[PDB]
């Protein structure tokens, strides 16, 4: 049959049919494969063996690889899905699986490796890092090829006994939606070598015919034993070739180890791999038709590299070859495929000029114009070697010049772009539109979706294509027949109409009439609309959704508007297909919700209005841009162009060579995405600063000021007298940042006043006023205040050093980290694991961590997902070494002729260098005396003082903080976390426990509780939550605390200060509510209160220092719960979707046994 | 050195003696509740080893057997290797327990402490192995401090297992 799938589903489709076991661990962009395979098993899909696939999630990809090895050696056909850092961790077992000649297929959505920076996007770096493991390597260039070559790998590996890596380009193919021919499981079973399967069973580990494998070998036999597998590798090309003939006879699609496309007498040929082959062939057709003698060799079987099969498809007329590698091996003579092609041609005496280049790193665009640039370089008198395409390398001058722009899209292909808002339904509707068009017409259909780094309110751009010819355009749309803008705010912000064809369609969602178009649309947009004679349509979709009762959901409305004007299918047929999809999506929602979406379709047809614009729009002229403010070079040259969706134009000279970024750059974003913002009521405010404590974006803060400093304040900057003996004679005001607020509403819910002192008002109504208010509050001078930092009120007068991050509205993680920076941020270093905290904490080019007025703030680093504890441990060793070097120079100063005040501060620092307060006090004294002391010295004594000044940034004792999610702490990094805690180092571990993998969409973890439903736990998690805190208490010398800000502010304050002051390892497990729980994020703090009150989350503190004082180290901070445990589960969707009753009873019994055990440790 | 190395034991990468105590792998595995955990030593009790091996294999679930294995790296007469394991349990150096999750399903206590009261001297067992006596030959002033911590940690471990059984 024909279905519209993406690469991941196409790969899982074949892997599911051919496998008994799948041991997995999630990683973008390969995890959709394991997710859909788990869903199919949950609904009872049968493989070719008549059984459902067994999906097992491990603690890491290393654990997955070992499970693959054991399952294979014991007689089960086993597969797995991975990519990038995950593939690296499987490399050790890949050597074993190949060495033991076990049939296997790893499905890899090829993704870049983490180098100077992490990248979730696609290139071949991960697959190339494993090319020496002995796995065969088979590359798929399109979604159709993912379907076909996945079957080839599974069939070939049984015959050859050589395991396969079947890889396809991450996102660019794994997430590209295409209508393809889907191979039936029954047809797969007719091609399987069942004798080869039975022989595999006979080799299995079995006590009734046992054997030994995995021995240790001496030099006498190891070399011979390693070469004994040569026949299997010599035979694999012929076996793969023959399997390709089986698939050809079944499907009609003919694959070869190397395929050729282009002129039979071509003189310039590109050798490439992966989805680039699609782009190159489309370009080759265009150039060959124009008379150019060019061609393309597609590499399917990269390993083993068969010289015979490569040379057979190489035309004898070839004089020049350009090899394209989607990877970079720094310092290498050339990249892997280039060195293979160069080698094979030398071994056979071919006099062919060969040149290698790099492309598409991290999903860098690779379009036909770049393909021609490669062909033009082959046509030059001296072709450039070791080149790059797709960038402007103005430092080392490796990039090829993109001379001209060509359009190689096949004629008759319709092209549409959809600019949407994050989670507004645009992407989902476009996927449904592709399914509609693919299922009911003869046209090929293609979809690709560009996402944003911002989790809420980000920009999404959908790229859709339909045509009578196969769609090989594995690149973004250049010339669109239709462009849709589903968010009117984008008008004037992004280049929406870029590249639209003359006479094309522009569909807009806005409340503006045709006359208001003159004043609302920018001049450049009006010029494009008029000159290209576009059909301009507008629709007030929000008005329709409001009147019907759908709120502000416009997904059904905007999809209806698209088919009405696109002329892709008969309008009457489209309306039926849309309503049929509505029944499939909203049939379970009820009868009322159904007919509302039916009314959305009907009203959308009549509300679509064509805008008759005057021809004089073509001559409109840009308005004079206001005098722009002088912004820093990084903001002006890097941050603004990236946010303007122009980062691809930045040349190499723009960036640091090591991926180092400035701090405090999110304050320049000012996204202004909130619908409502808190308005402060001065008369109801008790000045408690709890609103500043719970804000996940530091958008609301208290401000103190002497009455003289309120001089130039706007009339609306209403203040109140400051409560407290510390702030006597001062003014107080709770001020919100309107453009940085998210409208989550946590501050209004936490406000404990009798009458609410914070009320949610629409942003647009008060935005002009509050911007002037915030601009004055932000420029207020610093006020020296003696408020106790150990209190909630006192800590919020300290400046937050984590602000305006990309976390969701109401995120339960960032308030914890924000509070830590307010207590110790002046002197802390952060080692952050991969996950949500690394995405909102460190997504280029904006850094939410910032500095205070002295320029001091947290230094931030993220290494890997698995190494974060050891990462911060290494930092602690280095900081201790740097303080030792400083202490050595200061001790020498005591023997030097320096002032008595300098020696007094030096002795005070030496005695208290390991105390936070004393090291700052005497450290700041030395800093104040240094400039004068150096002036009064000369010779070697002056050098001794200059060495102290060189190291003065280590006088204050540092605070190492190891921050990461529960998936890091409980699973992949648990082994490293256990070791660092056992080491005794003075580090502070903060685990933001969301009980799921929050970043990757919500997959299961060991921190997931009983009965909770997440990915890889479709039927609910049976095993209970692993008690990380209890295992850390077994050491006795580890400070362990369980906290929840929503439940107790004072208990959180008490544990954080105790953990940091403790001279040893400290572990803080913080309950972090998340959007994946299925709750109202407005009441994120309230959900943590119900968690502790229902016995779901404990509050305790384990202080090893109490044991030395003769006291009980374990303190139970909440002994008797007052809320029902079963009622708390009912407040989150992650538990209600199970309804199942057996899991709810098991979850309550585990919470009582855990609470009773904590009572035993305290008694 | 390993995390299973005890306090005061001298090994490579622990030239001055291991300061941190032995990681309690059995205690962490019992935190799950559904893992069968047992600590055995053949030289100390033949019948207790028979009991744990059969219970662990018949248990329909994960089973963990931590067996004390005397080694040449301990610095002992391997002729009396079985006897060295008996002195370890008799001195409170190595515990004998069994954590049976099936007993919890029967309403009983899953944890059974198979050796409650030690009768031998803890320090006398340490002086019978070279891996501890080389610490006394290296740093005499620091050896007494490490031996005292090892005996205090072993008594706190014994008191914890008595609490789980009571
Ligand atoms: C070796 C490796 N495997 C998988 C991944 C993909 N990955 C990164 S973070 C993450 C899950 C994050 O979970 P958690 O630690 O709980 O943080 P959270 O997002 O919940 O805050 C995954 C699966 C990776 N980056 N590296
Ligand atoms: S509504 Fe949310 S984001 Fe806005 S100030 Fe209040 S807590 Fe902060
Ligand atoms: S929570 Fe309410 S009462 Fe407390 S400081 Fe904020 S606005 Fe004032
Ligand atoms: S932890 Fe949850 S709420 Fe916070 S940023 Fe990640 S997905 Fe959003
Ligand atoms: Mg998590």
Q: CA-CA distances (angstroms) from residue A792 to A90, A578, A757, A797, A816?
A: 47, 53, 18, 9, 13
Neighbours of A753 (CB within 10 A): 15
Query: 3-state DSSP call for residue A1103?
Result: coil
Tokens, residue B3: 């995390």
Q: How far is the CA of A965 from the centre of ligand 5 (A)?
A: 5
What is the β-pairing status of strands A459-467 and A444-450? Answer: antiparallel
C-alpha–C-alpha distance, residues A912 and A921, integer Å: 9
Cβ–Cβ < 8 Å for A326, A276: yes
User: Residues preceding discontinuities in chain A at C–N > 2.5 Å?
Assistant: 1139
Q: Which of A423, A659, A460 is nearest to A555 (CA)?
A: A423
What is the β-pairing status of strands A414-421 and A482-485? Answer: parallel
Q: How far is the CA of A729 from the centre of ligand 3 (A)?
A: 20
Q: CA-CA distances (angstroms) from residue A921 to A133, A177, A954, A957?
A: 57, 62, 13, 11
Please tell me if the CB atom of residue A809 comes closer than 6 angstroms to any atom of ligand 4. Answer: no
**A802 DSSP 8-state letter:** B
Give yes or no: A885 in active site: no
Cβ neighbours of residue A504 under 8 Å, at least 6 residues apart?
Answer: A480, A481, A482, A483, A532, A534, A535
The verdict on whether omega for the bond into residue A502 sits within 30 degrees of 0, i.e. cis, is no
Query: How far is A978 from chain B, CA to nearest CA, in Å?
Result: 10
**Which residues, listed in sequence order, are joined to residue A715 by a DSSP beta bridge?**
none
C-alpha–C-alpha distance, residues A968 and A980, integer Å: 14
Residue with tokens 């002046």: A826
C-alpha–C-alpha distance, residues B138 and A71, integer Å: 50
| Angle formed at CA A695 by CA A694 and CA A699, multiple of 5 degrees | 150
SS3 content of chain B, % helix, strand, coil (to 5): 50, 10, 40
Cβ neighbours of residue B131 under 8 Å, at least 6 residues apart?
Answer: B9, B10, B11, B73, B74, B75
Tokens, residue A521: 């649309």
- Burial-class residue A939 by CB neighbours within 10 Å (0-12, 13-18, 19+): exposed
Which experiment gave this structure?
A: X-ray
A881: left (phi over 0), alpha (psi -120 to 50) or beta: alpha
C-alpha–C-alpha distance, residues A713 and A703, integer Å: 13
As a dihedral over the C-alpha atoms of residue A1102, residue A1108, residue A1109, residue A1111, rounded to 10 degrees, the angle is 50
Q: Which of A33, A70, A73, A69 is nearest to A53 (CA)?
A: A33
Q: Is A741 annotated as a binding residue?
A: yes
Ligand 2 atom nearest to A746, measured from its CA: 7
Residue with tokens 């501060």: A905
Cβ–Cβ < 8 Å for A1047, A1093: yes
| Angle formed at CA A668 by CA A666 and CA A672, multiple of 5 degrees | 90
In the 3-class helix/strand/coil scheme, how is A737-750 assigned residue by residue?
A: CCCCCCCCCHHHHH
Query: From the DSSP assignment, how many helices (H) and strands (E) are in chain B?
Result: 7, 4
Q: How far is the CA of A730 from the centre of ligand 5 (A)?
A: 42
Closest residue by Cα to atom 6, ligand 4, is: A836
In this structure, chain B runs to a length of 166
Q: Which secondary-structure segment (H or E) carries A1089?
A: helix A1084-1093
C-alpha–C-alpha distance, residues A101 and A1147, integer Å: 45
Nearest by CB to B28, which of A983, A1023, A1031? A1031
What does the buried/exposed string (b/e) look like for A819-837 if buried means 16 or more CB atoms within 10 Å of the residue's CB? bbbbbbbbbbbbbbbbbbb
Please tell me if the CB atom of residue A699 comes closer than 6 angstroms to any atom of ligand 2. Answer: yes
What is the β-pairing status of strands A609-610 and A535-539? Answer: antiparallel
C-alpha–C-alpha distance, residues A240 and A156, integer Å: 5
C-alpha–C-alpha distance, residues A309 and A306, integer Å: 5
Extended beta strands in A1082-1126, E state: 1100-1102, 1114-1116
Tokens, residue A506: 């522009």
Backbone CA torsion sign across A417, A421, A423, A425: negative
Q: How far is the CA of A27 from the centre of ligand 1 (A)?
A: 7
Query: Which ligand has an atom closest to residue A742 CA?
Result: 2
The verdict on whether omega for the bond into residue A845 sits within 30 degrees of 0, i.e. cis, is yes
Half-sphere exposure of A733 (CA within 13 A, CB side): 23
A725 — phi, psi (to 5°)?
-70, -25
Tokens, residue B35: 């893992």
Q: CA-CA distances (angstroms) from residue A517 to A520, A522, A529, A626, A723?
A: 5, 9, 11, 22, 52
Cβ–Cβ < 8 Å for A566, A436: no
Contacts of B4 in chain A (CB under 8 A): none
Q: CA-CA distances (angstroms) from residue A998 to A118, A838, A866?
A: 18, 12, 16
Query: Which ligand has an atom closest to residue A743 CA?
Result: 2
Resolution of this structure in Å: 2.6
Extended beta strands in A274-385, E state: 294-299, 301-303, 320-325, 353-359
Q: How far is the CA of A717 from the centre of ligand 2 (A)?
A: 19
**B99 DSSP 8-state letter:** E
Give yes or no: A61 in active site: yes
What residue of B is the nearest CA neighbor of A1154? B31
What residue of B is the nearest CA neighbor of A1006? B32
Q: Is A906 annotated as a binding residue?
A: no
What does the buried/exposed string (b/e) look like for B25-41 if buried means 16 or more CB atoms within 10 Å of the residue's CB? ebbbbbbbbebbbbbbb
C-alpha–C-alpha distance, residues A698 and A666, integer Å: 11
Query: 3-state DSSP call for residue A676?
Result: strand
Q: Is A836 annotated as a binding residue?
A: yes
In this structure, chain A runs to a length of 1163
Query: 3-state DSSP call for residue A423?
Result: coil
C-alpha–C-alpha distance, residues B140 and A235, integer Å: 67
Q: CA-CA distances (angstroms) from residue A616 to A619, A620, A1063?
A: 6, 7, 75
Q: A868-894 and A900-912 helices cross at what angle (nearest 10)? A: 150
Neighbours of A420 (CB within 10 A): 27
Q: Which of A728, A640, A747, A620 is nearest to A689 (CA)?
A: A747
Neighbours of A21 (CB within 10 A): 19
The verdict on whether omega for the bond into residue A29 sits within 30 degrees of 0, i.e. cis, is yes
C-alpha–C-alpha distance, residues A1084 and A1072, integer Å: 9
Q: Which of B120, B66, B70, B54 is nearest to B97 (CA)?
A: B66
| Angle formed at CA A242 by CA A237 and CA A246, multiple of 5 degrees | 145
Q: Which of B17, B153, B82 is nearest to A1036 (CA)?
A: B153
In the 3-class helix/strand/coil scheme, how is A873-909 assigned residue by residue?
A: HHHHHHHHHHHHHHHHHHHHHHCCCCCHHHHHHHHHH
Cβ–Cβ < 8 Å for A1005, A60: no
Give yes or no: A999 in active site: yes
Cβ–Cβ < 8 Å for A26, A997: yes
Query: 3-state DSSP call for residue A907?
Result: helix
Q: CA-CA distances (angstroms) from residue A617 to A112, A491, A497?
A: 46, 16, 15
C-alpha–C-alpha distance, residues B24 and B28, integer Å: 7
Q: Is A428 annotated as a binding residue?
A: no
A618 — phi, psi (to 5°)?
-65, -25
The CA-to-CA distance between both ends of chain B, in Å, stands at 34
Residue with tokens 């009820």: A590
Q: Which secondary-structure segment (H or E) carries A428?
A: helix A426-440
Tokens, residue A1084: 């994120």
Choose from B5, B6, B20 for mutation: most chain A CBs within 10 A: B20
Neighbours of A290 (CB within 10 A): 9
CB contact under 8 Å between A1030 and B20, yes or no, is: no
CB contact under 8 Å between B20 and A983, yes or no, is: yes
Ligand 3 atom nearest to A702, measured from its CA: 5
Query: How far is A871 from chain B, CA to nearest CA, in Å?
Result: 20
Ligand 1 atom nearest to A969, measured from its CA: 15
Calculate the CA A472 to chain-centre distance.
27
* Longest CA pairwise span in chain B (Å): 53
**A215 DSSP 8-state letter:** -
Residue with tokens 């990681």: B23
A790 — phi, psi (to 5°)?
-75, -5
Query: 3-state DSSP call for residue A678?
Result: strand
What is the DSSP code string of A930-946?
A: HHHHHHT--HHHHHHHH
What is the β-pairing status of strands A353-359 and A320-325? Answer: parallel
Query: 3-state DSSP call for residue A1072?
Result: coil
CA R_g for chain B: 16
Tokens, residue A78: 């086993």
- Burial-class residue A449 by CB neighbours within 10 Å (0-12, 13-18, 19+): buried
Ligand 3 atom nearest to A680, measured from its CA: 7
Tokens, residue A326: 């989607």
What is the DSSP code string of A603-638?
A: HHHHH-EE----GGGGG--PPPPP------HHIIII
**Which residues, listed in sequence order, are joined to residue B36 by a DSSP beta bridge?**
B63
CB contact under 8 Å between B28 and A1026, yes or no, is: no
Q: CA-CA distances (angstroms) from residue A788 to A706, A791, A793, A850, A897?
A: 20, 6, 8, 23, 40
Half-sphere exposure of A554 (CA within 13 A, CB side): 24
Nearest by CB to B24, which of A984, A1034, A1160? A1034
Nearest by CB to B28, which of A979, A1034, A1036? A1034
What does the buried/exposed string (b/e) look like for A173-202 if buried means 16 or more CB atoms within 10 Å of the residue's CB? bbbbbbbbebbebeebeebbbeeeeeebee
Contacts of B19 in chain A (CB under 8 A): 984
Q: Which of A990, A1103, A975, A1112 is nearest to A1045 (CA)?
A: A990
C-alpha–C-alpha distance, residues A646 and A819, integer Å: 35
Query: How far is B80 from chain A, CA to nearest CA, in Å?
Result: 30
| Angle formed at CA A879 by CA A874 and CA A885, multiple of 5 degrees | 130
C-alpha–C-alpha distance, residues A440 and A438, integer Å: 6
Query: 3-state DSSP call for residue A104?
Result: coil
C-alpha–C-alpha distance, residues A958 and A205, integer Å: 54
CB contact under 8 Å between A982 and B31, yes or no, is: no
How many A/B residue pairs have CB atoms within 8 Å? 29
Q: A900-912 and A916-935 helices cross at what angle (nearest 10)? A: 150
**A668 DSSP 8-state letter:** G
Neighbours of A75 (CB within 10 A): 15
Contacts of B28 in chain A (CB under 8 A): 1031, 1034
Cβ–Cβ < 8 Å for A310, A337: no
CA R_g for chain A: 32
Tokens, residue A322: 């350009």
**A782 DSSP 8-state letter:** P
Cβ–Cβ < 8 Å for A672, A739: yes
Residue with tokens 């690709």: A448
Calculate the CA A440 to chain-centre distance.
35
C-alpha–C-alpha distance, residues A389 and A396, integer Å: 13
Instruction: List residues in chain B touching A: CB distance below 8 A.
Output: 3, 19-21, 23-24, 27-28, 31-34, 156, 163
């Amino acid at each position: 049959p024909k279905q519209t799938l993406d690469g991941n589903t196409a790969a899982a489709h074949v892997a599911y049919a051919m496998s008994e076991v799948a041991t997995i661990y999630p990683i973008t962009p390969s995890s959709p494969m394991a997710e859909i395979a788990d869903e199919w098993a949950a609904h009872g899909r049968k493989n070719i063996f008549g059984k459902t696939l067994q999906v097992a999630e491990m603690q890491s990809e290393a654990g997955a690889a070992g499970a693959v090895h054991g399952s294979l050696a014991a007689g089960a056909l086993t597969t797995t899905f991975t990519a990038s850092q995950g593939l690296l961790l499987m490399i050790p077992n890949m050597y074993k699986i190949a060495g033991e000649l076990l049939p296997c297929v790893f499905h890899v959505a090829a993704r870049a490796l983490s180098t100077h920076a992490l990248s979730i996007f696609g290139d071949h770096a991960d697959v190339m890092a494993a090319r020496q493991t002995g796995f065969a390597m088979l590359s798929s260039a399109s979604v159709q090829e993912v379907m076909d070559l996945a079957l080839v790998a599974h069939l070939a590996t049984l015959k050859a006994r050589v395991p396969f890596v079947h890889f396809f380009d991450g996102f660019r193919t794994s997430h590209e939606v295409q209508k393809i021919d889907v191979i039936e499981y029954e047809d797969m079973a007719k091609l399987v070598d069942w004798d080869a399967i039975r022989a595999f069973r006979q080799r299995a580990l079995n006590p009734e015919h046992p054997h030994q494998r995995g021995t240790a070998q001496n030099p006498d036999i190891y070399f011979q034993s390693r070469e004994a597998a040569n026949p299997y590798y010599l035979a694999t090309p012929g076996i793969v070739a023959q399997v390709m003939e089986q698939v050809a006879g079944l499907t009609g699609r003919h694959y070869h180890l190397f395929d050729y496309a282009g002129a039979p007498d071509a003189e310039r040929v590109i050798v490439s791999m992966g989805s680039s082959c699609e782009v190159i062939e489309e370009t080759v057709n265009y150039l060959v038709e124009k008379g150019e003698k060019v061609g393309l060799i597609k590499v399917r079987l990269f390993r083993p590299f068969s010289a015979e099969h490569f040379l057979k498809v190489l035309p004898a007329s070839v004089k020049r070859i350009a090899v394209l590698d989607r990877t970079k091996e720094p310092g290498s003579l050339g990249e892997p495929l280039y060195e293979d092609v160069q080698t094979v041609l030398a071994e056979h005496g071919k006099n062919i000029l060969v040149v290698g280049g790099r492309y598409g790193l991290g999903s860098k665009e690779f379009n036909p114009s770049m393909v021609k640039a490669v062909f033009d370089n082959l046509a030059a008198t001296t072709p450039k070697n070791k080149f790059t395409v797709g960038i402007t390398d103005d430092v080392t001058h490796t990039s090829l010049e993109i001379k001209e722009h060509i359009d190689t899209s096949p004629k008759g292909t319709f092209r549409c772009k959809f600019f949407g808002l994050g989670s507004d339904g645009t992407v989902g509707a476009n996927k449904n539109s592709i399914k509609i068009i693919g299922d009911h017409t003869d046209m090929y259909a293609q979809g690709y979706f560009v996402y944003d780094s911002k989790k809420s309110g980000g920009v999404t751009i959908s790229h859709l294509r339909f045509g009578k010819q196969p769609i090989q355009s594995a690149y973004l749309i250049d010339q669109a027949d239709l462009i849709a803008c589903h968010n009117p705010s984008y008008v004037g912000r992004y280049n929406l109409l870029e590249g639209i064809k003359p006479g094309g369609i522009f569909l807009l969602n806005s409340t503006w009439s045709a006359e208001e178009m003159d004043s609302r649309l920018p001049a450049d947009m009006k010029r494009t609309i008029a000159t290209k004679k576009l059909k301009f349509y507008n629709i007030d979709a929000v008005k329709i959704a409001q009147e019907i009762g759908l709120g502000s959901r416009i997904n059904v409305i905007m999809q209806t508007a698209f088919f009405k004007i696109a002329n892709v299918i008969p309008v009457d047929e489209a309306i039926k297909y849309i309503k049929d999809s509505i029944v499939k999506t909203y049939g379970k929602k009820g009868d009322k919700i159904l007919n509302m979406n039916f009314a959305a379709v009907d009203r959308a047809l009549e509300a679509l209005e064509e805008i008759k614009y005057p021809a004089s729009w073509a001559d409109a002229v840009d308005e004079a841009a206001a005098t722009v403010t002088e912004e820093p070079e990084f903001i002006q040259k890097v941050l603004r162009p990236i946010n303007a969706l122009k980062g691809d134009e930045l040349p190499v000279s723009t960036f640091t060579p090591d991926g180092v970024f400035p701090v405090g750059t999110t304050k320049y974003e000012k996204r202004g995405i909130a619908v409502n913002i808190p308005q402060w009521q001065p008369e109801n405010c008790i000045q408690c600063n709890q609103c500043s404590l719970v804000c996940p974006h530091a958008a609301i803060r208290p401000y103190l000021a002497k009455p003289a400093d309120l001089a130039g304040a706007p009339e609306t900057f209403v203040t109140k007298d400051a409560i407290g003996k510390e702030a006597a004679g001062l003014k107080f005001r709770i001020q919100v940042s309107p453009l940085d607020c998210t409208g989550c509403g946590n501050c209004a819910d936490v406000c404990p006043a009798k009458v609410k002192a914070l009320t949610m008002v629409p942003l647009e109504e008060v935005t002009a006023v509050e911007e002037a208010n915030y601009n004055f509050a932000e420029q207020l001078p610093e006020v020296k205040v003696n408020f106790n930092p150990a209190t909630v009120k006192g800590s919020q007068f300290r400046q937050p050093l984590l602000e305006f991050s990309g976390a969701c509205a109401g995120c339960g993680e960032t308030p914890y980290v924000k509070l830590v920076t307010q207590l110790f941020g002046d002197r802390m270093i952060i080692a952050n694991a991969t996950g949500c905290s690394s995405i909102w904490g460190g997504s280029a080019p904006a850094c939410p961590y910032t500095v205070n007025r002295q320029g001091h703030g947290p230094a931030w680093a993220s290494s890997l997902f698995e190494d974060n504890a050891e990462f911060g441990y290494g930092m602690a060793l280095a900081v201790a070494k740097r303080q030792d070097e400083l202490a050595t120079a200061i001790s020498k100063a005591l023997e030097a002729p320096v002032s008595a005040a300098f020696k007094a501060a030096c002795e005070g620092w030496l005695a208290g260098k390991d105390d936070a307060d004393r090291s700052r006090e005497y450290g700041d004294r030395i800093k104040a005396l240094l400039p004068g002391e150096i002036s009064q010295a000369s010779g070697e004594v002056k050098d001794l003082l200059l060495d102290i000044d060189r190291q003065k940034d280590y006088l204050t004792k540092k605070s190492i903080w190891i921050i990461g999610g529960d998936g890091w702490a409980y699973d992949i990094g648990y082994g490293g976390l256990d070791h660092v805690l056992a080491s005794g180092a003075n580090v502070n571990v903060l685990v933001l426990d969301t009980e799921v993998y929050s970043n990757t969409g919500g997959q299961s973890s060991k921190a997931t509780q009983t009965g909770a439903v997440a990915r890889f736990a479709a039927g609910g998690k049976f095993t209970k939550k692993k008690d990380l805190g209890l295992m850390a208490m077994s050491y006795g010398y580890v400070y362990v605390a369980s906290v929840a800000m929503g439940a107790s502010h004072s208990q959180l304050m008490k544990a954080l200060i105790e953990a940091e002051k403790y001279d040893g390892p400290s572990l803080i497990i913080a309950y972090a509510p998340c959007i994946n729980h299925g709750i109202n994020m407005t009441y994120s703090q309230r959900e943590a209160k119900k968690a502790v009150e229902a016995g779901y989350w404990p509050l305790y503190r384990y202080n090893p220092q109490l044991a030395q004082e003769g006291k009980n180290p374990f303190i139970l901070d909440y002994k008797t719960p007052t809320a029902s445990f079963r009622d708390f589960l009912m407040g989150e969707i992650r538990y209600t979707s199970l309804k199942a009753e057996q899991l709810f009873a098991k979850a309550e019994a585990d919470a009582k046994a855990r609470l009773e055990q904590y009572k035993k440790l305290a008694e | 050195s390993s995390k299973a190395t005890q306090t005061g034991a001298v090994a490579r990468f622990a030239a001055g003696g291991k300061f941190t105590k032995k990681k309690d792998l059995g205690l962490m595995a019992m935190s799950y509740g559904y893992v069968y955990v047992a600590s055995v030593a053949m030289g100390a009790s033949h019948s207790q080893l028979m009991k744990a091996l059969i219970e662990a294999e018949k248990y329909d679930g994960p089973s963990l057997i931590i067996a004390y294995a005397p080694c040449i790296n301990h610095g002992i007469n391997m002729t009396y290797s079985q006897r060295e394991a008996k002195k370890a349990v008799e001195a409170g150096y190595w515990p004998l327990y069994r954590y049976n999750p099936q007993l919890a399903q029967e309403g009983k206590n899953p944890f059974i402490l198979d050796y409650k009261t030690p009768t031998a001297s803890f320090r006398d067992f340490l002086m019978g192995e070279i891996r501890y006596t080389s610490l006394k030959k290296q740093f005499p002033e620091k050896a007494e401090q490490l031996f005292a911590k090892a005996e205090a940690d072993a008594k706190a471990r014994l008191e914890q297992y008595k609490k789980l059984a009571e």
